[PDB]
Amino acid sequence: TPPVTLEAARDNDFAFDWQAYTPPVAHRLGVQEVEASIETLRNYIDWTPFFMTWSLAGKYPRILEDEVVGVEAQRLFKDANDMLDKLSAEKTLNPRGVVGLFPANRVGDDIEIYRDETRTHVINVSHHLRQQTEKTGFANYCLADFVAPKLSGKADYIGAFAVTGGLEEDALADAFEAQHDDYNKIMVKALADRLAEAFAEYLHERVRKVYWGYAPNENLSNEELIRENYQGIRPAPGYPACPEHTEKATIWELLEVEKHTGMKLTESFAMWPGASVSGWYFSHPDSKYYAVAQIQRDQVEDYARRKGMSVTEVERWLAPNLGYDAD
């Protein structure tokens, strides 16, 4: 579809009646270090991606019943589960995380995060991109649209989190590798992954129910959680609704991630350990995932100005999304 100017994009933003909506107030504002045991996390594991890691197709649990790959799947799963028992027992892989909730308001395509409820001092800004193609009856989405504009005078909030399956991940895989045991070496990385992702599901649930607290009586099964049948979203930088990776640096700063979990970001803004998940929390009932997709040169120059970066640095990071021939 033909791109649109940034201005026409911004003119077709998410239309909602803010004067008639009262965003839910965050019950626990602030930053809180969190933890979760392997035992608790196992109830939140989505196993389908583990089987796909072992090049097996099929969705858990039906996959355990496949007359051809069923038996290999059952072996994998049994070994998966005995290793979990062992890391659980020996406390050798320890999931760590941090979560935070903040007063926030939308100004343009960005989200201002305030030091407190007087909302007079911006401690950080969460920058976002807006879809830049001609949209038919649908707004040109930007994640900032799901937070109340500062102009509406409504108090709103945003949350963030960073979780890891454990800082031991490499020590464990490194040891399986030294003795040429690539099976378990894969096994331990595949599990740390499931655990990181389980912790993100579990923590999002605690946020919906207690920390932000807008859905205190929520009672979803793990399959309902996997189907995302809850109110709200937890977009992660790097994913399609927010493809710009350097924003992981804002989360690291807001939650003081390294100080509270030992998790670090690299030169290309990847997270260490490898089994880690970071992102934002949005409470709006209408929030959803989508792809920003191809963005034009006017959006790149504006984004660079807001971020305080040169247009070429922004070109490096948004390269998969430039809707024009970059250089």
Ligand X SMILES: C[S@@+](CC[C@H](N)C(=O)[O-])C[C@H]1O[C@@H](n2cnc3c(N)ncnc32)[C@H](O)[C@@H]1O
Residues lying near ligand X in the complex (CB under 6 A):
46, 49, 197, 226, 234-236, 239-242, 279, 289-291
| Region of residue 265 (left: phi > 0; alpha: psi -120 to 50; beta: else) | beta
Contact 243, 113 (CB under 8 A): no
Residue whose tokens read 């909602």: 16
| Polymer length of the chain | 327
Residue 120 CB, shortest distance to ligand X, in Å, is 31
Residue 45 CB, shortest distance to ligand X, in Å, is 8
Strand partners, 164: 96, 276
Nearer to ligand X, 173 or 242 (CB): 242
CA distances from 140 to 132, 143, 211, 245, 318 (A): 7, 10, 31, 21, 18
Nearer to ligand X, 114 or 317 (CB): 317
Residue 217 CB, shortest distance to ligand X, in Å, is 22
Residue 38 CB, shortest distance to ligand X, in Å, is 16
Nearer to ligand X, 176 or 289 (CB): 289
Residue 220 CB, shortest distance to ligand X, in Å, is 13
Residue 121 CB, shortest distance to ligand X, in Å, is 28
Contact 299, 9 (CB under 8 A): yes
**In this structure, what is the dihedral angle of CA atoms 122, 284, 213, 93, given to the nearest 10 degrees?**
-80
Tokens, residue 120: 């007079």
Residue 46, annotated ligand binder? yes
Nearer to ligand X, 242 or 265 (CB): 242
- 3-state percent breakdown (helix, strand, coil) of the chain, nearest 5: 40, 20, 40
Whole-angstrom distance, CA of residue 157 vs CA of residue 136: 30
Residue 223 CB, shortest distance to ligand X, in Å, is 10
Nearer to ligand X, 63 or 114 (CB): 63
Tokens, residue 172: 């464990």
Contact 261, 199 (CB under 8 A): no
Contact 3, 67 (CB under 8 A): no
Whole-angstrom distance, CA of residue 103 vs CA of residue 245: 23
List the one residue out of 187, 157, 153 whose CA is nearest residue 172: 187
Nearer to ligand X, 108 or 240 (CB): 240
Nearer to ligand X, 44 or 114 (CB): 44
Residue 239 CB, shortest distance to ligand X, in Å, is 3
Nearer to ligand X, 106 or 194 (CB): 194
Residue 290, annotated ligand binder? yes
Whole-angstrom distance, CA of residue 174 vs CA of residue 192: 14
CA distances from 68 to 47, 57, 300 (A): 19, 11, 50
Residue 75, annotated ligand binder? no
Residue 194, annotated ligand binder? no
Cite the annotated binding site for S-adenosyl-L-methionine by residue number: 46, 234, 289-290
